[PDB]
């Protein structure tokens, strides 16, 4: 960061950095891994596993 600005932005239009208002440090925000859930089955009739 240059010494006159307090944020960092992306194409996504959300903040991704921030200068901590105490330590003058630069912190990167990484979102948590939402992912997706799928399930495999061989059918009800044959088994339940």
């Amino acid at each position: 960061f240059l010494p006159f600005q307090q944020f960092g932005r992306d194409i996504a239009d959300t903040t991704d950095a921030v200068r901590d208002p105490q330590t003058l440090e630069i912190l990167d925000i990484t979102p948590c891994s939402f992912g997706g859930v799928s399930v495999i089955t061989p059918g009800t009739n044959t088994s339940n596993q």
Binding site: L2, Q6, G8, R9, I11
Partner: protein
């Protein structure tokens, strides 16, 4: 003891570019609209000699 002379003029070459905000970006394009200095304009000239 001031000699008066006709005003003089010259041309601008891509001047008047300033960071319109206080936010960081990088390696990316961006369109902005603000009060700027249009390119290749005709500016007024002053000496002191």
């Amino acid at each position: 003891t001031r000699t008066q002379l006709p005003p003089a003029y010259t041309n601008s070459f891509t001047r008047g570019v300033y960071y319109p905000d206080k936010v960081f970006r990088s390696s990316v394009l961006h369109s902005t609209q603000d009060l700027f200095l249009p390119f290749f304009s005709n500016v007024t000239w002053f000496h002191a000699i």
